[PDB]
């Protein structure tokens, strides 16, 4: 079964399962590359389910743009297997960005300040860290991101 | 210098595990363990695991929160010569914990066997505490029921959510073997031996 | 001088994807091939980067099973080059990028059995991309379609406990969630006790 995501007026169907299966293959390896055990980017005071539905779609779109603009394409590993998986994750994430963009075009991805506020916070955390550490850390945090999306009833 | 650090987590009872270091004999090494909470700042002591003889430490109380991730380290001790600090991987109990089997209870008829499962319980904090159905933590918890007819070597599965299932229209004086696995849809987890119970239908 | 492979096409059946091309026929050793791909992500965000396929890094036949590669419902670009020892041809490109949305969906295989009054079904194992909608009915004028979803094809699943009356019928179709499409139903087939 697909995951029906309730983002206020924006409702999309996502293949959460495909992405989780792809990521479980690399979680351990990736998370091992991340030395900054004291910094959490997706902090939990910014969880999606805790967000007013009107604002969820906006938040999620930015988070995806974050990952697509500066995580997936920049994670460095010599391991071909790993690289292929990462392409899977990114293209899977792209289908979702595509639906959110539609919601946006239909004027149902309103960016309110609860949304911008929580994104800036996340973006801040990510910007604290030195580049490669940053991407390594966010890639390793897909499990939180995918759960945030599963959480939203 | 211990190694092979890992959690074994079934039903939220989370247990840290390592295997002895490398010492030819050093028959007396003890172990101390610290636990860290991802995204927070301070490593923490575990008193009941300061200097112990075992290679396993129960961290269920320290890692009870569903929203957090944890790490754990352990080192080996001799005199005051301590080999470094052995560090686990990021551990996420809410997604990683094995869901255990419901306990199965078979009762019979001549045509019909009734299966009643009682949902797996979550690790209890205080011995006197309010029991918790894993099916409250995972509201979408389903059971996969397998029925084997020993007479025919025939077998068939089915998924259910209701705690009670009546198998009807069965061959009489036949012995049927039922076993049930628990599954939460979501991230793939480590499975867990289903519970395997038998029952014979009554004679014609 | 070594010709770069021609007539690339993809042959996609039940979400298994085969990249094909005219073989390169040249005198030398045996001709080996190298296939690479890029998903829409790579195309738009990092256009000059290709990911080498998981099984066709120097393989014999003029074909490739890219199934483990096309793992998202977006257009993919695929290129192939041929190589004879030293000489390596130019990269040849698939004229129309492939989207798995176009895979051909076969009617599912079906095996209905009876453990007594117990109607049971085991479907063709088409893999995790697939779910089955099984329709069974008690073949009488009043009775309706029941519908059960079966998750996988390895397994014998319990449909219903038949009553001595009527004779039951079953048909089956697939559902691929990743592309939102169903196959045609299987032939209806019936039974009784
Ligand atoms: C099954 C397993 O985890 N084996 C590992 C092995 O690869 C490694 O040499 C050792 C490091 O001390 O830890 C253990
Ligand atoms: C949902 C799930 O866990 N599927 C299992 C399947 O793998 C297995 O064949 C069967 C055992 O008979 O139980 C069911
Ligand atoms: C009795 C039965 O069918 N058990 C199944 C087996 O056939 C299958 O290989 C496996 C993978 O799903 O799960 C289990």
Swiss-Prot record, chain A:
<dbReference type="InterPro" id="IPR020423">
    <property type="entry name" value="IL-10_CS"/>
</dbReference>
<keyword id="KW-0732">Signal</keyword>
<dbReference type="GO" id="GO:0045618">
    <property type="term" value="P:positive regulation of keratinocyte differentiation"/>
</dbReference>
<dbReference type="GO" id="GO:0050727">
    <property type="term" value="P:regulation of inflammatory response"/>
</dbReference>
<comment type="function">
    <text>Pro-inflammatory and angiogenic cytokine mainly secreted by monocytes and skin keratinocytes that plays crucial roles in immune responses, regulation of inflammatory responses, hemopoiesis, as well as epidermal cell and keratinocyte differentiation. Enhances tissue remodeling and wound-healing activities and restores the homeostasis of epithelial layers during infection and inflammatory responses to maintain tissue integrity. Affects multiple actin-mediated functions in activated neutrophils leading to inhibition of phagocytosis, granule exocytosis, and migration.</text>
</comment>
<dbReference type="GO" id="GO:0045518">
    <property type="term" value="F:interleukin-22 receptor binding"/>
</dbReference>
<comment type="subunit">
    <text>Forms a 1:1:1 heterotrimeric complex with its primary high-affinity heterodimeric receptor IL20RA/IL20RB.</text>
</comment>
<keyword id="KW-0964">Secreted</keyword>
<protein>
    <recommendedName>
        <fullName>Interleukin-20</fullName>
    </recommendedName>
</protein>
<keyword id="KW-0202">Cytokine</keyword>
<dbReference type="GO" id="GO:0006955">
    <property type="term" value="P:immune response"/>
</dbReference>
<dbReference type="GO" id="GO:0005125">
    <property type="term" value="F:cytokine activity"/>
</dbReference>
<dbReference type="InterPro" id="IPR009079">
    <property type="entry name" value="4_helix_cytokine-like_core"/>
</dbReference>
<keyword id="KW-1015">Disulfide bond</keyword>
<feature type="disulfide bond">
    <location>
        <begin position="57"/>
        <end position="109"/>
    </location>
</feature>
From Swiss-Prot, chain B:
<feature type="disulfide bond">
    <location>
        <begin position="177"/>
        <end position="198"/>
    </location>
</feature>
<comment type="function">
    <text>The IL20RA/IL20RB dimer is a receptor for IL19, IL20 and IL24. The IL20RA/IL10RB dimer is a receptor for IL26.</text>
</comment>
<feature type="glycosylation site" description="N-linked (GlcNAc...) asparagine">
    <location>
        <position position="153"/>
    </location>
</feature>
<feature type="domain" description="Fibronectin type-III 2">
    <location>
        <begin position="98"/>
        <end position="204"/>
    </location>
</feature>
<feature type="glycosylation site" description="N-linked (GlcNAc...) asparagine">
    <location>
        <position position="144"/>
    </location>
</feature>
<comment type="similarity">
    <text>Belongs to the type II cytokine receptor family.</text>
</comment>
<feature type="glycosylation site" description="N-linked (GlcNAc...) asparagine">
    <location>
        <position position="162"/>
    </location>
</feature>
<feature type="glycosylation site" description="N-linked (GlcNAc...) asparagine">
    <location>
        <position position="53"/>
    </location>
</feature>
<feature type="disulfide bond">
    <location>
        <begin position="49"/>
        <end position="57"/>
    </location>
</feature>
<feature type="glycosylation site" description="N-linked (GlcNAc...) asparagine">
    <location>
        <position position="45"/>
    </location>
</feature>
<protein>
    <recommendedName>
        <fullName>Interleukin-20 receptor subunit alpha</fullName>
    </recommendedName>
</protein>
<feature type="topological domain" description="Extracellular">
    <location>
        <begin position="1"/>
        <end position="204"/>
    </location>
</feature>
<comment type="subunit">
    <text>Heterodimer with IL20RB and heterodimer with IL10RB.</text>
</comment>
<feature type="domain" description="Fibronectin type-III 1">
    <location>
        <begin position="1"/>
        <end position="97"/>
    </location>
</feature>
<feature type="glycosylation site" description="N-linked (GlcNAc...) asparagine">
    <location>
        <position position="4"/>
    </location>
</feature>
Swiss-Prot record, chain C:
<dbReference type="GO" id="GO:0001808">
    <property type="term" value="P:negative regulation of type IV hypersensitivity"/>
</dbReference>
<feature type="glycosylation site" description="N-linked (GlcNAc...) asparagine">
    <location>
        <position position="7"/>
    </location>
</feature>
<dbReference type="GO" id="GO:0002437">
    <property type="term" value="P:inflammatory response to antigenic stimulus"/>
</dbReference>
<dbReference type="GO" id="GO:0002765">
    <property type="term" value="P:immune response-inhibiting signal transduction"/>
</dbReference>
<dbReference type="GO" id="GO:0048873">
    <property type="term" value="P:homeostasis of number of cells within a tissue"/>
</dbReference>
<feature type="glycosylation site" description="N-linked (GlcNAc...) asparagine">
    <location>
        <position position="101"/>
    </location>
</feature>
<comment type="similarity">
    <text>Belongs to the type II cytokine receptor family.</text>
</comment>
<dbReference type="GO" id="GO:0005886">
    <property type="term" value="C:plasma membrane"/>
</dbReference>
<dbReference type="GO" id="GO:0032753">
    <property type="term" value="P:positive regulation of interleukin-4 production"/>
</dbReference>
<keyword id="KW-0732">Signal</keyword>
<feature type="domain" description="Fibronectin type-III 1">
    <location>
        <begin position="4"/>
        <end position="103"/>
    </location>
</feature>
<keyword id="KW-0677">Repeat</keyword>
<dbReference type="GO" id="GO:0042130">
    <property type="term" value="P:negative regulation of T cell proliferation"/>
</dbReference>
<keyword id="KW-0325">Glycoprotein</keyword>
<feature type="disulfide bond">
    <location>
        <begin position="56"/>
        <end position="64"/>
    </location>
</feature>
